[PDB]
Design an enzyme around this catalytic site. Sequence first.
Site, PDB file in Angstrom:
ATOM      1  N   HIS A   1       3.873  -9.829  -2.754  1.00  0.00           N
ATOM      2  CA  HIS A   1       2.496 -10.126  -3.113  1.00  0.00           C
ATOM      3  C   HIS A   1       1.613 -10.031  -1.864  1.00  0.00           C
ATOM      4  CE1 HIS A   1      -0.675 -11.746  -5.579  1.00  0.00           C
ATOM      5  NE2 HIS A   1      -0.835 -12.792  -4.789  1.00  0.00           N
TER       6      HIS A   1
ATOM      7  N   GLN B   1      -7.718 -10.403  -9.818  1.00  0.00           N
ATOM      8  CA  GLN B   1      -7.077  -9.099 -10.069  1.00  0.00           C
ATOM      9  C   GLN B   1      -6.722  -8.842 -11.536  1.00  0.00           C
ATOM     10  OE1 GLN B   1      -3.757 -10.012  -7.275  1.00  0.00           O
ATOM     11  NE2 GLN B   1      -2.444  -9.057  -8.815  1.00  0.00           N
TER      12      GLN B   1
ATOM     13  N   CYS C   1      -3.056  -6.626  -5.766  1.00  0.00           N
ATOM     14  CA  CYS C   1      -3.083  -7.588  -4.663  1.00  0.00           C
ATOM     15  C   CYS C   1      -3.182  -6.881  -3.302  1.00  0.00           C
ATOM     16  CB  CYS C   1      -1.825  -8.479  -4.711  1.00  0.00           C
ATOM     17  SG  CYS C   1      -0.268  -7.557  -4.559  1.00  0.00           S
TER      18      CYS C   1
ATOM     19  N   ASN D   1      -5.984 -15.703  -1.759  1.00  0.00           N
ATOM     20  CA  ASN D   1      -5.305 -14.975  -2.843  1.00  0.00           C
ATOM     21  C   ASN D   1      -6.335 -14.223  -3.678  1.00  0.00           C
ATOM     22  OD1 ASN D   1      -3.158 -14.162  -4.445  1.00  0.00           O
ATOM     23  ND2 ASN D   1      -2.792 -16.143  -5.380  1.00  0.00           N
TER      24      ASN D   1
HETATM   25  C1  LIG Z   1       8.765  -0.214   7.485  1.00  0.00           C
HETATM   26  N1  LIG Z   1       7.944  -0.608   6.346  1.00  0.00           N
HETATM   27  C2  LIG Z   1       8.335  -1.936   5.914  1.00  0.00           C
HETATM   28  C3  LIG Z   1       7.566  -2.332   4.674  1.00  0.00           C
HETATM   29  N2  LIG Z   1       6.154  -2.173   4.900  1.00  0.00           N
HETATM   30  C4  LIG Z   1       5.225  -2.993   4.297  1.00  0.00           C
HETATM   31  O1  LIG Z   1       4.078  -3.097   4.721  1.00  0.00           O
HETATM   32  N3  LIG Z   1       5.748  -3.667   3.211  1.00  0.00           N
HETATM   33  C5  LIG Z   1       4.928  -4.365   2.319  1.00  0.00           C
HETATM   34  C6  LIG Z   1       3.882  -5.124   2.781  1.00  0.00           C
HETATM   35  C7  LIG Z   1       3.093  -5.802   1.881  1.00  0.00           C
HETATM   36  C8  LIG Z   1       3.329  -5.723   0.529  1.00  0.00           C
HETATM   37  C9  LIG Z   1       4.383  -4.957   0.070  1.00  0.00           C
HETATM   38  C10 LIG Z   1       5.177  -4.285   0.969  1.00  0.00           C
HETATM   39  C11 LIG Z   1       4.697  -4.826  -1.373  1.00  0.00           C
HETATM   40  N4  LIG Z   1       4.345  -3.526  -1.881  1.00  0.00           N
HETATM   41  C12 LIG Z   1       5.165  -3.039  -2.851  1.00  0.00           C
HETATM   42  O2  LIG Z   1       6.107  -3.666  -3.334  1.00  0.00           O
HETATM   43  C13 LIG Z   1       4.864  -1.678  -3.302  1.00  0.00           C
HETATM   44  C14 LIG Z   1       5.006  -1.370  -4.630  1.00  0.00           C
HETATM   45  C15 LIG Z   1       4.735  -0.100  -5.077  1.00  0.00           C
HETATM   46  C16 LIG Z   1       4.325   0.866  -4.188  1.00  0.00           C
HETATM   47  C17 LIG Z   1       4.182   0.541  -2.860  1.00  0.00           C
HETATM   48  C18 LIG Z   1       4.452  -0.729  -2.410  1.00  0.00           C
HETATM   49  C19 LIG Z   1       3.984  -5.890  -2.162  1.00  0.00           C
HETATM   50  C20 LIG Z   1       2.530  -5.930  -1.784  1.00  0.00           C
HETATM   51  C21 LIG Z   1       2.433  -6.469  -0.387  1.00  0.00           C
HETATM   52  C22 LIG Z   1       5.716  -0.978   5.597  1.00  0.00           C
HETATM   53  C23 LIG Z   1       6.579  -0.731   6.817  1.00  0.00           C
END
Ligand SMILES: CN1CCN(C(=O)Nc2ccc3c(c2)[C@H](NC(=O)c2ccccc2)CCC3)CC1
Length: 219
Positions: free
Chosen positions: A165, A20, A26, A185
Amino acid sequence: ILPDSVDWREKGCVTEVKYQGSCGACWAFSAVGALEAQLKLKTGKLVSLSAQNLVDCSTEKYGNKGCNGGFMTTAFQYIIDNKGIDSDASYPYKAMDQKCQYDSKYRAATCSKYTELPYGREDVLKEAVANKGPVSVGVDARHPSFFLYRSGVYYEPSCTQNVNHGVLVVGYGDLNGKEYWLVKNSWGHNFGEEGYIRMARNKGNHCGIASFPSYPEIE
Ligand SMILES: CN1CCN(C(=O)Nc2ccc3c(c2)[C@H](NC(=O)c2ccccc2)CCC3)CC1
């Protein structure tokens, strides 16, 4: 009865490890990785899909911020809404935010739906990895030990369930009495075991690996 171990690389459902660079994409790599496996299962062809397409096109409308982060689930919804994603070869990765350049003539996959697994349930995650395919997950990768991982099964007492991540679970097993998740990864082949990390499994949702798992499906 679920198999005691799974490795989707053995079934030819996992593409080469990607790099990346200095772009926080990621989430895009995790999403394409999951869809790449489904595409192989459906069509018999293993094809790298375009992470750049997600970075450039699954943007504000999807709550994503390109090189500044995003969600695997909303990436899947973009692919569904867009009725496709281009191949990596046709829409290569540049590790920067660019204008959306999606073209359907270079479409290599579609997505009809995605499923979010219940929070923290490692047994449900095991079932999905065994029965469905690789699963997109978030992990807590902020700890210095993560970057320096080389071998064995990664267990970090300071890890949390605050994930930061996006990675891809491509398998699970047991190595010398330590259960693990096999994680792909996107920090290139120099990271870990040729781009992979074995992360502690059934150790209280270690590093939040089972916090937010999801996988796409193709009609
Ligand atoms: C109820 N919600 C609970 C949270 N959720 C997830 O899938 N969280 C999630 C799942 C995976 C990841 C992240 C969040 C992180 N993404 C962010 O930090 C980020 C940053 C900027 C913009 C957008 C998102 C890190 C990458 C991996 C959806 C349902």
